[PDB]
A paper describes a structure:
Composed of a diverse array of proteins, the tegument is an amorphous aggregate sandwiched between herpesviruses’ icosahedral capsid and outer envelope. While tegument proteins in general are well-differentiated to carry out highly host-specific viral functions, tegument proteins related to the capsid vertex-specific component (CVSC) have in recent years been identified as key players mediating critical functions universal to all herpesviruses. These include in HCMV the CVSC proteins pUL77 [pUL25 in herpes simplex virus 1 (HSV-1)] and pUL48 (HSV-1 pUL36; also called large tegument protein), as well as pUL48’s non–CVSC-binding partner, pUL47 (HSV-1 pUL37; also called inner tegument protein). We resolve atomic structures of portal vertex-associated tegument (PVAT) and identify multiple configurations of PVAT arising from layered reorganization of pUL77, pUL48 (large tegument protein), and pUL47 (inner tegument protein) assemblies. Analyses show that pUL77 seals the last-packaged viral genome end through electrostatic interactions, pUL77 and pUL48 harbor a head–linker–capsid-binding motif conducive to PVAT reconfiguration, and pUL47/48 dimers form 45-nm-long filaments extending from the portal vertex.
Numbering used by the authors:
A (entry chain H): 1 to 49
B (entry chain T): 44 to 156, 162 to 290
C (entry chain K): 1029 to 1370
D (entry chain G): 1 to 176
E (entry chain G): 298 to 592
F (entry chain V): 6 to 116, 121 to 248, 258 to 306
G (entry chain K): 246 to 588
H (entry chain U): 4 to 242, 254 to 306
The structure:
């Protein structure tokens, strides 16, 4: 129930990310609580309510 | 915090009671000047039907004193009416010795920064064997009706049960003998009208690790006690149950 | 020798020193200027001071690692005393009163006791029907929760770390959240076990309704009457419900191991009692995650024990066989070296 | 025990009303098996006169004497017959002793003093103590009366036995 | 001061103890006599003439015959209908069959099966197990309701457009009881609860276990089965699914004779059940010897 | 914790002097406002000639009872007490107190200074009584209520005359009869008929309910109940019950005993550990 | 151990570096004993340094715009001004996070021990000072527990017996040595302790073992198997024929040319010992209890579950309690009664 | 000992939960064990409720739990305060009952509300924050009377005649709101109360004097009124100078009758927990003193 669209639109700071194990494994084995994974370009972020 | 009152008692009553920790009761007798006489569980143990013979004779020798005899003689008339004749005054914290003595007992309080309540051993029993964290403690009197006359039982007991109704529901469960003996007295002789089977008074709450077993000495005689090492007193009313 | 064999299970606690690694700025500590609160009386006055810490984890893997580096003492006796099954199941009796009393005397037990009523069990934190011993030079009573076993169970089963119940039940192998497949893996006996391929090495433990299963599964205990204060080593292998409940993904089960699966045991009483006051520390249990038990040095006759005490350090590791006499060697070199070298 | 005494008291309070006298019975491992005696819920009894007429009815028949209806809106006197049948059963008191015992030793452990003629002491795996009343049409008992014993369990299944009063009273009464 | 009834009751004690048997001589139980019962003070009379015993035994004969008379009635109906239709009977239960077979041997096996069933007539049987729910109070109103609702003309359109739904009378699954006889090893299965469904493909019956599994009888040449419906229709079927059908006829008994015997029980409330009507219930109390007794 | 009260009328110097004498009495008010008018103080507002004692007892139970404080000009302060704290209370009752009593409150019954009147309004304070006396006098009034219908007989006249007087440690009383003009008031009427009818209802109902209970787990205490019930039934003979009727009778038993709860329950208010040599006033711990 | 820890989300690159030598990679914390052992063991790699450390905590204050969003929506978006400015200007990226905006620029030096692990420089703390004389245990002092298991009374096949230690130990010929009825263990310290079956009596005599009521209950609840081989295992008929003309009726049963199904208990007796545990043992779903038999059989053509006790130990399945084991038990009995030279 | 009880919540509570839990400051929540540090899973009545079991056992467990006031809800910590005897406290009601002045309040397990809303508060997982009902004395003793009378009537009655009576008995109207008694199973917890009531009724029936038995018949000889007529109809089908008179006899017999009526009344009574002062007009909250 995160504001993923806001995360996409908002400005971000870049870091050299270092996952212990491959990122898709970390997401697939849910090391992180709450997730969103999409493929390609998903236009969900292009409207503001 | 604590509240205290001052009382006069003569030495003959005080003798074994002289130690700092005790529970004080008042006797009202229909006499003219000495209406109220101040007695304790140490003396009341003589008539407690649940105490063993050896301790009974120990107290019989200990309270040979003159005034204690007349005090005991007033218990003879009316077993069922005993708790009516009794009134309670809390637990004692002060002692000064003399022919006429001045002693202090608290009605509602504790001691900040030792304050124990003593119990003679056979007066003590529990309905728990793993003590709850906070123990409510009582003075209860139960009547043995199955005999040629009724004999009174005396107990001080510790329990975590705070609600009176459930408490009496379990008390009836374990004291079913006295209920049946009461009804046996009623069916046997309707001439005299018996009152309740047992009487509850609420006074106290303590923490279980602050309950000690202790050994007590007076007049070079030696009797063993159970004690509530840091006693908190909250004096309630006598309540009856059949 | 009666017509059957036994297999014992017991849990021993070790007091350990561990070393921790953490990179620079693994996490950021947020603190506030302390808050003071006041309670005052006419005899003395007391101040309560409070300060809040908020820790924000600053990495995408695991930024800190621990290992149990050193150990020197066992809080349990490493004994072989048997659990008092009468105390844990106290209400139950034999039909015939005379034979019940005969068995009570013969096996040395008190009379049966009624369980504390639900109101009492709520008001006080358990019954604790068994008291402290007068003295104990060793540690806590590591009660062995025996389970029954066929006379001819395969001897090799005991020489390597296995599940004592006789079937593979580590929920890391099963696909996550497939409760149907997991119950199949633990209970089906037409699909061989995943560890020692066969239907089962102990048919009186590994399938639903065995005496071990009804003895040590907390569900069947709940259907029965028992006291929950008494910690039992065997329960962690037979509690199907939370074994299946742990059938989650890799990182969530790691986090559950390091946070939630820890045991709590009272440190003072001789009998291992459970604890929920939170004031007592929790205990790390690798056997829970691995879902296996460790083999410990055991031998039939004093001959092999003495010939292993006779030989040089390291003989405890081996497992040896005489005509009818076996030796089970300890899988980690604990007893001879790790405890006493200190 | 306690049920026998209590029911002997209670029947005296209603001897004139019911015209029934109390009868105290014991059951063992030969009347019902262990689990049934352990889970017994109700015990019922019903009287039958020497002519085959129940006591929940007047002797002069009833409308239930009719042949079976075979209808569907009526089943067999649907509600009327069912309620009359519920009328013709009376409920008795009972107690279960779930342990093996010797009956004389149990009774002497109790307050009684059993004074039987010789040591035909008997053993049983368990005991239930039922008590029943049997009816006096006038101040007399007919030897051909029949008394029925019914036992019901929590699942609603029941067992049903019937006894004729002559065997119960064979020379208990003709000697008296 | 008064003497108490229980005290003199105890001190007087008992001296009588004897065993008695039920009339069928199947059960024994003990009768106890207390010397303080008011029975001894009453001094009432006793009479045991032979005529009364004879009458009681005749009443007992009727009480016993109440079940075997229904057995005999259904048997006689089977035979009467078997002559009525010329013995040639249609298929009524669905199973595949061969024209090239020795049907005469199955006819003789049917004769054997019905004889063996007649020998093993018993109180527990599909006819009695179907009668027992018929006697309960609900069955009158329930069957009345079923006939009334069945007797409904096709709805007028506004009834179907508006208001609470229209419904269909019967459920897709029927509830049945059956008697199964096997001749190759003399054996009869009487207390059977069984589920039945009428096939949609053909108007014939498919029979199922109370698990959903199909029954095996129609394939086995050595078995014959009897069927009864909850509305007391009736079938006797021999291998191949060919059945003889008729009413279950019970006009051979008075209402009280079967009613008093087979009246299904209804509870009266006792500790451990909810006061709300028909509510869910905990596990039974079961005062038991395996646990330390409570007060 | 304070409550202020203002008198509408004037006040002579003698009347304000008469008020200040009561500077430690137990004065109840119907309910707790911050400021109240003088009428509500005391029991005077409830003193209708048609009602009397028993209803006033329950009213006194329900009200809040306060102690008095030293007086401002035209406005009196009432101090509402707190549980477990000591206060000085004045014994307006005609009894002597001793260090250790349990004290109860009940409406006055046996009454020049009491006329603390500002015109047709009188400050009738309640009585403070040692608990055994209160229980016994409640019993005695109630028993006087029961003989009320038979006052024509000479021996019951003597029995009532003997009941009315009670003697206590250096004290004597004459309790007024609960009947006036040979008629009984409505509250006493209801109380006594309810007591009598709960007795009758118990006698009628317990016989069937002991059997209804006994079928399951009948035991010795219930057998003793049966013995006493049978003897009571036989001794009363000196010479198939429908559901809703039983519901009505069973409900009535409990509602009747609920009406009695005013006179059945006797709660404590004060317990004393001090007394003046003058015995004019005492100090007590507050309860309830 | 050190290389496994992933690097942080961020770092103040100038904070916690050796004055001239190195950048600090991580800190290792452990009790005094372990740290002392490391200091003695890896002496060549351990050296004393002075490092630059932040002198004060980072002071984080929040914008008034964050206060307004907090009152209204109950949330913060830190460095609100930067986000607003970057969204107005169109810049994609922010220079640094909210927490790199704290703890800055106040460096003061302190001296530590360090160890070299390849590229990594790691600090070492022995937190003795923080806990001495206090009433709380060091959280690095831990309780860990393990679960152990061992057999007793287990019996090895005579068909394949062998010795690996014949030259080491030799035993008397007695049967007590032959049949392993006890086990020996070691105490908390290395001292021998023994378990007999006698020690087991406190558990093995409990009624809970001997009551299969839950066993039978869940045996019925699970339901019979639908597999065809198990299906041929299920069928079994028993009934109570009258005993009146029992003898004379015997030939009539054999007149019928119909073979009968083996009972489950009968089938269980032909599985040899080494494969009673394999999947091919059809009957295994039955074997729930050592003292009791379970089975599914038919009555009224319904399938029901039957339970019955194994009155004598001889009734146990051959695979679970073999015959030669019974011969050894008999030899043990004779040895106990000193009849081993049998009359 | 400790006057403040700290409750810790085991979730990452969002805005919704931390806001709606802030909305319940000064509500009463029951605590079993009365200790310093307590987890949210053993707060409220959620674990003790089980519909397959009775309302009687839920009431029995509720009487023994201790009551606390909720204050200063902060991050994952709820800070329950235990009210001290004889002080002035504010309380927030949960049930739809309306509170007057002067009324004494008793704690009862929640009932089945007339239109059955229940409004789903705090479902943080499988848990739910079930709160008890705070009810004025007349309704509490009314519902206790109803449960006891329903148990007494219900025994040995078949279901069909039971239904018509219980559908009338089960519903209680009180101050224009109506509630239903949820689960009146005949538990042994109720059998103990019924046995005590039967013994007390028998005893009061026995020792009552002849004048106490004869009063209402003497009053029917004396007077005629609607109340007396209703009593007459109650006694209808069940129906000189005393043989000896004495005052002290009456004193003794009446005192015994009082102890027995005290038992019988106590079986209906419940222990008071709050006495109210003037109430916020929207029934939302009232000021009360904590009693016992």
């Amino acid at each position: 129930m995160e504001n993923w669209s806001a995360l996409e639109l908002l400005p971000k700071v870049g870091i050299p990310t270092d996952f212990l194990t491959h990122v898709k494994t970390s997401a697939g084995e849910e090391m992180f609580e709450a997730l969103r994974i999409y493929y390609g370009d998903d236009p969900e972020r292009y409207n503001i309510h | 915090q604590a509240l205290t009152a001052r009382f006069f008692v003569p030495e003959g009553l005080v003798e074994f009671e002289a130690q700092p920790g005790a529970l004080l009761i008042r006797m009202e007798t229909g006499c003219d000047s000495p209406r109220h006489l101040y007695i304790s569980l140490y003396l009341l143990g003589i008539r407690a039907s649940n105490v063993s013979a050896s301790t009974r004779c120990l107290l019989e020798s200990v309270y040979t004193a003159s005034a204690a005899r007349a005090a005991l003689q007033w218990l003879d008339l009316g077993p069922h009416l005993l708790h009516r004749r009794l009134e309670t005054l809390g637990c004692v914290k002060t002692v000064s010795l003399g022919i006429t003595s001045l002693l202090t007992c608290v009605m509602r309080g504790y001691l900040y920064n030792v304050f124990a309540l003593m119990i003679p051993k056979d007066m003590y029993l529990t309905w728990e064997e793993t003590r709850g964290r906070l123990q409510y403690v009582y003075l209860i009197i139960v009547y043995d009706y199955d005999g040629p006359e009724t004999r009174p039982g005396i107990y001080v007991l510790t329990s975590s049960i705070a609600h009176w109704q459930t408490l009496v529901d379990v008390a009836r469960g374990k004291f079913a003998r006295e209920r049946c003996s009461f009804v046996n007295r009623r069916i046997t002789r309707p001439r005299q009208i018996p009152l309740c089977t047992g009487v509850i008074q609420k006074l106290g709450w303590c923490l279980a690790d602050d309950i000690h077993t202790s050994f007590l000495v007076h007049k070079e005689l030696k009797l063993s006690v159970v004690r509530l090492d840091n006693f908190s007193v909250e004096l309630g009313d006598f309540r009856e149950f059949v | 020798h009666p017509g059957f064999a036994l297999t014992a299970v017991r849990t021993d606690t070790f007091e350990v020193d561990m070393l921790l690694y953490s990179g620079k700025s693994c996490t950021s500590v947020i603190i506030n200027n302390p808050i003071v609160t006041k309670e005052e009386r006419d005899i003395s006055t007391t101040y309560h001071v409070t300060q809040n810490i908020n820790t924000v984890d600053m990495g995408l893997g695991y930024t800190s690692n621990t290992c149990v580096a050193y150990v020197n003492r066992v809080r349990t006796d490493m004994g072989v005393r048997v659990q008092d099954l009468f105390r844990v199941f106290p209400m139950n009796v034999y039909r015939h009163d005379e034979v019940d009393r005969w068995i009570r005397h013969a096996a040395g037990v008190e009379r049966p006791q009624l369980l504390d009523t639900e109101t009492i069990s709520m008001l006080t934190f358990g019954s604790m029907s068994e008291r402290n011993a007068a003295a104990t030079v060793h540690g806590q009573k590591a009660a062995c929760e025996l389970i029954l076993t066929p006379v001819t169970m395969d001897v090799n089963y005991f020489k390597i770390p296995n599940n004592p119940r006789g079937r593979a039940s580590c929920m890391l192998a099963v696909d996550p959240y497939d409760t149907e497949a997991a119950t199949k893996a633990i209970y089906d006996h037409r699909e061989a076990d995943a560890q020692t391929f066969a239907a089962t090495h102990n048919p009186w433990a590994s399938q639903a309704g065995c005496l071990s299963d009804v003895l040590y599964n907390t569900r069947h205990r709940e259907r029965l009457g028992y006291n929950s204060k008494f910690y039992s080593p065997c329960a962690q292998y037979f509690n199907t419900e939370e074994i299946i409940a742990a059938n989650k993904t890799l990182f969530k089960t790691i986090d559950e191991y390091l946070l939630r699966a820890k045991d709590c045991i009272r440190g003072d009483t001789d009998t291992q009692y459970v604890c929920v006051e939170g004031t007592e520390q929790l205990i790390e249990n690798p056997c829970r995650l691995t879902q296996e038990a460790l083999p410990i040095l055991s031998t039939t006759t004093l001959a092999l024990m003495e010939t292993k005490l006779k030989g040089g350090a390291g003989a405890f590791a081996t497992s040896e066989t005489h005509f009818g006499n076996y030796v089970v060697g300890e899988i980690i070199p604990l007893q001879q070296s790790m405890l006493f070298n200190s | 025990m306690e049920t026998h005494l209590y029911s002997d008291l209670a029947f005296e309070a209603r001897f004139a009303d019911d015209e029934q006298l109390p009868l105290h019975l014991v059951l063992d491992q030969e009347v019902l098996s262990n689990e049934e005696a352990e889970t017994l819920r109700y015990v019922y009894y019903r009287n039958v006169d020497s002519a085959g007429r129940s006591t929940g009815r007047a002797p002069g028949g009833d409308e239930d004497d009719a042949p079976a209806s075979d209808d569907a809106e009526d089943a067999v006197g649907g509600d009327r017959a069912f309620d009359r049948e519920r009328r013709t059963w009376q409920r008795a008191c009972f107690r279960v002793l779930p342990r093996p015992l010797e009956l004389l030793d149990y009774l002497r452990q109790s307050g009684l003093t059993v004074t039987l003629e010789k040591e035909q002491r008997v053993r049983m795996f368990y005991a239930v103590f039922t008590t029943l009343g049997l009816r006096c049409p006038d101040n007399r008992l007919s030897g051909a009366q029949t008394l029925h014993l019914r036992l019901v369990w929590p699942d609603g299944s029941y067992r049903d036995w019937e006894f004729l009063a002559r065997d119960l009273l064979r020379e208990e009464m003709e000697a008296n | 001061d008064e003497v108490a009834r229980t005290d003199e009751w105890k001190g007087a004690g008992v001296s009588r103890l004897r065993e008695v048997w039920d009339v069928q001589h199947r059960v024994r139980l003990r009768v106890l006599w207390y010397v303080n019962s008011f029975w001894r003070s009453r001094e009432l009379s006793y009479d045991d003439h032979e005529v009364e015993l004879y009458r009681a035994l005749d009443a007992y004969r009727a009480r016993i015959a109440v079940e075997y008379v229904l057995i005999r009635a259904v048997r006689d109906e089977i035979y009467a209908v078997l002559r009525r239709d010329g013995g040639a009977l249609p298929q009524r239960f669905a199973c595949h069959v061969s024209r090239n077979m020795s049907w005469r041997v199955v006819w003789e096996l049917c004769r054997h099966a019905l004889a063996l069933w007649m020998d093993w007539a018993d109180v527990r049987s599909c006819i009695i197990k179907a009668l027992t729910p018929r006697l309960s109070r609900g069955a009158a109103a329930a069957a009345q309701r079923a006939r009334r609702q069945r007797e409904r003309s096709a709805p007028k359109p506004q009834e179907l457009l508006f208001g609470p739904r229209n419904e269909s009378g019967p459920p897709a699954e029927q509830t049945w009881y059956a008697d199964v006889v096997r001749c190759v090893r003399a054996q009869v299965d009487l207390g059977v609860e069984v589920r039945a469904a009428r096939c949609p493909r053909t108007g014939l019956w498919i029979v199922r276990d109370r698990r959903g599994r199909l029954r095996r009888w129609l394939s086995q040449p050595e078995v014959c089965v009897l069927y009864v419906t909850p509305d007391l229709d009736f079938y006797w079927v021999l291998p191949g699914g060919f059945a003889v059908s008729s009413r279950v006829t019970l006009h051979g008994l008075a209402q009280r004779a079967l009613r008093d015997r087979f009246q299904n029980f209804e509870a009266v409330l006792a500790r451990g059940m909810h006061v709300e009507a028909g509510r869910q219930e905990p596990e039974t109390p079961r005062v038991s010897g395996r646990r330390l007794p409570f007060d | 914790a304070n409550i202020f009260c203002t008198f509408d009328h004037k006040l002579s110097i003698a009347d304000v002097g008469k008020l200040t004498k009561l500077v430690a009495a137990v004065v109840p008010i119907p309910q707790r406002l911050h400021l109240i008018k003088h009428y509500q103080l005391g029991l005077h507002q409830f003193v209708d000639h048609t009602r009397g004692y028993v209803r006033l007892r329950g009213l006194l139970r329900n009200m809040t009872l306060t102690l008095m404080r030293r007086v401002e000009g035209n406005q009196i302060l009432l101090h509402v007490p707190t549980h477990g704290l000591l206060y000085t209370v004045l014994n307006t009752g005609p009894v002597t107190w001793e260090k250790g009593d349990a004290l109860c409150v009940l409406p006055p019954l046996f009454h020049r200074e009491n006329l603390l009147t500002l015109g047709q309004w009188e400050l009738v304070l309640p009585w403070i009584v040692p608990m055994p006396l209160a229980l016994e006098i409640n019993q005695r009034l109630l028993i006087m209520g029961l003989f009320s219908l038979d006052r024509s007989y000479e021996e019951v006249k003597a029995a009532v005359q003997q009941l009315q007087t009670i003697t206590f440690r250096d004290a004597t009383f004459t309790i007024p009869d609960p009947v006036i003009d040979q008629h009984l008031l409505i509250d006493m009427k209801t109380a006594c008929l309810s007591m009598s009818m709960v007795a009758n209802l118990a006698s009628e109902l317990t016989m069937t309910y002991v059997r209804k209970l006994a079928l399951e787990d009948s035991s010795m205490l219930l057998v003793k109940c049966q013995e006493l019930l049978m003897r009571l039934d036989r001794e009363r003979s000196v010479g198939h019950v429908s559901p809703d009727d039983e519901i009505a009778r069973l409900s009535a038993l409990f509602v009747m005993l609920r009406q009695l709860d005013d006179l059945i329950r006797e709660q404590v208010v004060f317990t004393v550990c001090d007394v003046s040599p003058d015995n004019k006033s005492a100090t007590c711990i507050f309860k309830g | 151990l050190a290389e496994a820890a992933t690097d942080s989300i961020l770092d103040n690159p100038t904070t916690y570096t050796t004055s001239s030598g190195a950048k600090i990679s991580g800190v290792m914390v452990s009790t005094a004993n372990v740290m002392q052992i490391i200091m003695s063991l890896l002496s060549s790699h351990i050296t004393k340094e002075t490092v630059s450390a932040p002198a004060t905590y980072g002071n984080f204050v929040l914008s008034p715009e964050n206060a307004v969003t907090a009152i209204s929506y109950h949330s913060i978006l830190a460095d609100f001004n930067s986000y607003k400015a970057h969204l107005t200007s169109g810049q994609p990226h922010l220079p640094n996070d909210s927490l790199s905006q704290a703890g800055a620029h106040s460096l003061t030096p302190l001296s530590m021990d360090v160890i070299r692990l390849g590229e990594k420089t790691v600090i070492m703390e022995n937190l003795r000072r923080v806990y001495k004389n206090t009433d709380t245990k060091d959280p690095l002092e831990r309780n860990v527990d393990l679960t152990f298991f061992f057999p007793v009374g287990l019996y090895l096949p005579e068909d394949r017996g062998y010795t690996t230690v014949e030259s080491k130990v030799k035993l008397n010929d007695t049967v007590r040595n032959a049949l392993p009825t006890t086990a020996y263990l070691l105490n908390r310290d290395r001292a021998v302790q023994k378990i007999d079956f006698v020690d087991a009596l406190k558990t093995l005599c409990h009624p809970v073992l001997h009551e299969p009521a839950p066993c039978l209950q869940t045996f019925t609840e699970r339901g019979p198997p639908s597999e065809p081989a198990m299906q041929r295992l299920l069928e079994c008929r028993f009934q109570q024929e009258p005993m009146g003309g029992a003898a004379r009726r015997i030939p009539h049963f054999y007149r019928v040319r119909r073979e009968v199904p083996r009972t489950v208990n009968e089938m269980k007796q032909d599985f040899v010992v080494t494969d009673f545990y394999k999947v091919g043992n059809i009957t295994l779903y039955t074997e729930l209890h050592p003292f009791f038999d379970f089975t599914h059989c038919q009555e009224n053509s319904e399938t029901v579950a039957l339970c019955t006790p194994r009155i004598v130990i001889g009734n146990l399945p051959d695979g679970l309690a073999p015959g030669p084991f019974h011969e050894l038990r008999t030899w043990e009995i004779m040895e106990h009664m000193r009849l081993r030279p049998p009359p």
